[PDB]
């Protein structure tokens, strides 16, 4: 359907191994969006084309206020293009670097936004597995929007013990993540951060994390509950939504 001569490319939005994303405007519509630009070259080099049109599939058939709309796609000779919803306020990552850490009410809000988002996906039997801040865009409202689905069905920091060890994994993975994310939001760095892959593997495996003093009790409560070694003991997104520190602090 869409070609490249339908668009006016604008300021670049991002880098990344496979190419760039650019702000762009749909010529006949004046519509604003992001163009992710990827090569038929580099795709088949670091072989992933499977995962691609999977992401294409998944982020397509999906609809939710906290999932980045994917509108479409197209390739030429040299490359493949992704027509994305554009998210004004950039990444949760950058806001973090900027603020170095978020307050409880912010954290909690995101968590909800995130929970529900995750909820919709689980409802449609989709697991994301890679919900890192880098992957979390912000809408005009400032609302969590979840990009990327390359690994929807590398750094370990966000992976749970099952995945890391090589074992059987179901949708509970995302609850581990939500826990990590949650910890990161509040503390500024993730609970299992190491200087090497190897240390991280162990730290994660032994679920070794600690809290700085300023972490309110209820926070600890929720993260601990989410960061259980055993998938089974992990809350339900429901309970997560219904947690008393969530609902006491979630502005949304
Ligand atoms: O696909 C990516 N991929 C991607 C590439 C690089 C970084 C993040 C995402 N990004 C986007 C998809 N839709 N909208 C975006 C988007 N990227 C943005 C970047 C900025 C600039 N800055 C980034 C750091 O945080 C502050 C803002 C602003 C708004 C944006 N919307």
């Amino acid at each position: 359907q869409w070609a490249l001569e339908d668009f006016e490319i604008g300021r670049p939005l991002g880098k990344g191994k496979f190419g760039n994303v650019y702000l762009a405007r749909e010529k006949q519509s004046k519509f604003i969006l992001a163009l992710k630009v990827l090569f038929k070259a580099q795709l088949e080099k670091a072989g992933v084309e499977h995962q691609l049109r999977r992401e294409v599939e998944i982020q397509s058939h999906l609809r939710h206020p906290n999932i980045l709309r994917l509108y479409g796609y197209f390739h030429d000779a040299t490359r493949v293009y992704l027509i994305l919803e554009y998210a004004p306020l950039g990444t949760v990552y950058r806001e973090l670097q900027k603020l170095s850490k978020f307050d409880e009410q912010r954290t909690a809000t995101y968590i909800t936004e995130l929970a529900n988002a995750l909820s919709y996906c689980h409802s449609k039997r989709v697991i994301h597995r890679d919900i890192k801040p880098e992957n979390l865009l912000l809408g005009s409202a400032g609302e969590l929007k979840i990009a990327d689905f390359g690994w929807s069905v590398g750094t370990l920091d966000y992976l749970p013990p099952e995945m890391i060890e090589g074992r059987m994994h179901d949708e509970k993975v995302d609850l581990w993540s939500l826990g990590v994310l949650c910890y990161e939001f509040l503390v500024g760095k993730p609970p299992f951060e190491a200087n090497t892959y190897q240390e991280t593997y162990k730290r994660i495996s032994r679920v070794e994390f600690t809290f700085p003093d300023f972490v309110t009790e209820g926070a600890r409560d929720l993260i601990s509950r989410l960061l259980k070694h055993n998938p089974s003991q992990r809350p339900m997104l429901r309970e997560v939504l219904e947690h008393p520190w969530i609902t006491a602090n979630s502005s949304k």
Side-chain angles (χ1 to χ4, degrees), residues 1-198 200-252:
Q1 184 149 206
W2 301 110
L4 178 54
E5 72 176 332
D6 298 308
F7 293 97
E8 282 176 6
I9 310 326
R11 91 141 164 161
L13 291 158
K15 312 154 297 326
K17 182 153 166 278
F18 299 71
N20 297 301
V21 192
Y22 301 89
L23 187 65
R25 188 179 59 160
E26 197 275 69
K27 282 178 154 90
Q28 309 307 339
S29 178
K30 287 169 177 193
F31 199 96
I32 279 271
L33 48 73
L35 243 64
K36 209 152 207 174
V37 191
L38 306 178
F39 288 93
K40 316 214 80 171
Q42 291 178 116
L43 276 178
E44 295 155 35
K45 231 268 171 187
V48 272
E49 318 91 81
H50 9 81
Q51 283 189 132
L52 169 98
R53 283 135 81 263
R54 197 201 300 199
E55 166 172 357
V56 165
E57 146 99 332
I58 304 185
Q59 214 172 359
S60 174
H61 288 220
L62 271 48
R63 298 296 197 293
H64 195 285
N66 305 109
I67 304 187
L68 206 76
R69 281 292 319 273
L70 179 54
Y71 293 130
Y73 77 97
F74 63 106
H75 54 73
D76 44 349
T78 333
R79 40 210 173 192
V80 167
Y81 301 102
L82 290 161
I83 297 163
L84 290 175
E85 159 175 8
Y86 151 76
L89 307 171
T91 66
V92 168
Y93 178 84
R94 233 294 220 198
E95 203 83 321
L96 195 47
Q97 281 182 156
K98 284 165 74 196
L99 274 130
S100 33
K101 59 174 151 273
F102 300 164
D103 59 45
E104 316 188 56
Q105 26 286 339
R106 176 164 209 161
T107 304
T109 319
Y110 281 135
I111 290 306
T112 352
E113 269 150 58
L114 201 27
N116 305 131
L118 277 170
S119 213
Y120 175 92
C121 296
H122 286 146
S123 81
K124 292 208 154 284
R125 242 300 189 281
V126 195
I127 318 163
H128 189 235
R129 315 191 323 208
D130 196 37
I131 303 172
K132 61 214 176 187
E134 308 186 2
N135 274 21
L136 303 188
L137 290 167
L138 295 165
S140 84
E143 80 274 25
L144 221 68
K145 290 187 169 260
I146 294 189
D148 226 314
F149 289 71
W151 293 55
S152 204
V153 74
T155 186
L156 307 189
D157 253 300
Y158 294 94
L159 301 172
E162 45 280 40
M163 266 197 86
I164 196 201
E165 289 182 31
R167 318 203 319 285
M168 188 69 288
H169 84 274
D170 75 350
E171 81 274 332
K172 277 290 202 194
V173 291
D174 291 318
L175 270 98
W176 175 266
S177 297
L178 189 38
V180 173
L181 272 293
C182 176
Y183 175 105
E184 195 177 348
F185 285 173
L186 287 165
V187 177
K189 54 175 160 196
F192 305 123
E193 200 178 62
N195 286 285
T196 68
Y197 182 100
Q198 294 88 191
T200 313
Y201 187 110
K202 287 188 190 178
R203 282 196 75 212
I204 282 171
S205 224
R206 303 174 174 171
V207 178
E208 302 174 355
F209 66 81
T210 72
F211 295 106
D213 294 338
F214 69 77
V215 168
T216 74
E217 206 90 79
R220 309 200 177 194
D221 195 90
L222 163 45
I223 299 144
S224 304
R225 293 152 163 274
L226 279 166
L227 281 179
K228 286 262 178 175
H229 183 275
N230 224 264
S232 311
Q233 287 107 58
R234 283 174 215 158
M236 261 323 303
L237 294 162
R238 193 161 224 138
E239 290 158 273
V240 174
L241 267 338
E242 282 152 25
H243 193 282
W245 173 94
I246 287 300
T247 65
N249 294 283
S250 189
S251 269
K252 192 38 57 198

